[PDB]
Amino acid sequence: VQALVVDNGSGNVKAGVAGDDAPRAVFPSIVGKPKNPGIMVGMEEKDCYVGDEAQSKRGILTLKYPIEHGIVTNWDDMEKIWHHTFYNELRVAPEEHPVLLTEAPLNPKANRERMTQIMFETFNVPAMYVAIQAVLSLYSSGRTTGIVLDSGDGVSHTVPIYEGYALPHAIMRLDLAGRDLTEYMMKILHERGYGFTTSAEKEIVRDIKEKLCYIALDFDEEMKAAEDSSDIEKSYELPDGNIITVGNERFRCPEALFQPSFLGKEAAGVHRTTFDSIMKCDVDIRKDLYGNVVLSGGTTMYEGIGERLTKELTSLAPSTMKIKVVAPPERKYSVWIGGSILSSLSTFQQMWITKEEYDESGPSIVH
């Protein structure tokens, strides 16, 4: 009997069995419902268009994300997503193995309580545990000291840890992630006459962003250079065979991470958030936090993010410090691998919240 590890993000669902090196089932976290009447008699009108099945036939479906900034907004569809994960992707009986789940820090308590109640009463798991994503990202890297910058589709958070002890008063959360960048890309592609509006057009723009975008080392000089020559342009082919050309948007779209004012948000960039999280720690801790910054999440996968973040932090921190940003090649799956490591430890076997405790202490047993 091995635990199941299900990392539940705003954009993707990563599921698998503890002990594996990689998640065996990764599919987008969408639920689709048809927007047209079915006319041919003799077909099967499936209700659960979940994940890649909904992605494949998004032409006749309207797509909805049940998780928004890490908070579940539609529990009915989230239950469908969980059922899909347990029965069609992993193809296991959930009542046999305990399940390890993840949740972003500084989340409302009702979210976790509803999650626990749904797991214990609908799917009937023997036990569970809910862990923070940022501490698992540190488990994946085999280290006990460092500050983790996790950025996914819903929310970015920084969690500093020193010698295994957490520093909860220094945790920062920034609701600026990949979905905001996709929407900004949709907005600024209108400058060239490309109009994207539909839910499927959103998934097209997301695919454009994931391939053509990169982070410039400095923004103003790169702007001035781009206005002079056309070698920055690139071409992308739409599903129907139409060809579009993208220019300085390639480095304009991800710049909003460091300048949120591009999105109309009154906030500070990821570099400034990292620096301010470090500065809330004790003076003796700061050197080891500067010396080890961990990148996690898919949003940190832009080419050149490490150099840019190192330059910003070096410009902010005193000249004596040696800023070292750690960007593993597999940092898109750091949280899942960390959870896989955590669930297999012999020490962790006492933290399982069995159903007998839940029925004894109510939903608040998780806290």
Ligand X SMILES: C/C1=C\[C@H](C)C[C@H](C)OC(=O)C[C@H](c2ccc(O)cc2)NC(=O)[C@@H](Cc2c(Br)[nH]c3ccccc23)N(C)C(=O)[C@H](C)NC(=O)[C@@H](C)C1
Residues within the interface to Mg ion (CB under 5 A): 9, 152
111 touching ligand X, by CB under 6 A: yes
Contact of 184 with 263, CB cutoff 8 Å: yes
Q: Residues in the chain, how many?
A: 367
264 touching ligand X, by CB under 6 A: no
Q: Which of 18, 23, 7, 100 is nearest to 340 (CA)?
A: 18
d(CA 50, CA 83): 10
Contacted by 244, from a second copy, ligand ADP, ligand X, none: CB < 5 to 8 Å by type: ligand X
283 touching ligand X, by CB under 6 A: yes
d(CA 26, CA 51): 9
Show the tokens assigned to 273: 């958030």
Phi-psi region of 68 (alpha: psi -120 to 50; beta: other; left: phi over 0): beta
- Cβ-based nearer residue to ligand X, 4 or 155: 155
DSSP alpha helix (H) spans, the chain: 52-56, 75-84, 109-118, 133-140, 178-188, 199-212, 219-226, 249-252, 270-279, 286-290, 305-316, 334-344, 355-361
* Shortest spacing between CB 128 and ligand X, in angstroms: 19
- Candidates 64, 69, 311, 355: give the one binding ligand X (CB under 6 A): 69
Show Cβ contacts of residue 293 under 8 Å, excluding neighbours closer than 6 positions: 146, 147, 149, 274, 309, 313, 323, 324, 325, 326
321 touching a second copy, by CB under 8 A: yes
108 touching ligand X, by CB under 6 A: yes
329 touching a second copy, by CB under 8 A: no
| Beta bridge mates, 21 | none
- Candidates 252, 286, 308, 332: give the one binding a second copy (CB under 8 A): 286
Contact of 45 with 52, CB cutoff 8 Å: no
- Candidates 71, 263, 267, 341: give the one binding ligand X (CB under 6 A): 71
- Cβ-based nearer residue to Mg ion, 66 or 152: 152
d(CA 259, CA 268): 7
Segment lying near ligand X (by CB under 6 A), choices 136-144, 205-213, 237-245, 349-357: 237-245
Contact map string, positions 196 to 235, toward ligand X, x by CB under 6 A: x----x----------------------------------
- Candidates 110, 217, 225, 351: give the one binding ligand X (CB under 6 A): 110
Contact map string, positions 145 to 184, toward a second copy, x by CB under 8 A: ----------------xxxxxxxxxx----x---------
- Which of the residues 87 through 106 are near ligand X (CB under 6 A)? none
Give contact residues for ligand ADP (rule: CB under 6 A). Answer: 9-12, 152-154, 178-179, 182, 206, 210, 297-299, 301-302, 332
35 touching a second copy, by CB under 8 A: yes
Cα angle 342-345-346, degrees, rounded to a multiple of 5: 150
* Shortest spacing between CB 327 and ligand X, in angstroms: 27
* Shortest spacing between CB 360 and ligand ADP, in angstroms: 33
Segment lying near a second copy (by CB under 8 A), choices 10-18, 35-43, 213-221, 269-277: 35-43
40 touching a second copy, by CB under 8 A: yes
- Cβ-based nearer residue to ligand X, 8 or 334: 8
d(CA 129, CA 349): 10
| Beta bridge mates, 101 | 6, 130
**What letter would DSSP give residue 322?**
-
Q: What is the SS3 assignment for 152?
A: coil
d(CA 186, CA 204): 10
Segment lying near ligand X (by CB under 6 A), choices 93-101, 108-116, 134-142, 260-268: 108-116
Segment lying near ligand X (by CB under 6 A), choices 82-90, 125-133, 192-200, 259-267: 192-200
What does the binding site for ligand X look like in residue numbers (CB under 6 A)? 69, 71, 108, 110-111, 175, 190, 193-196, 201, 238, 242, 244, 283
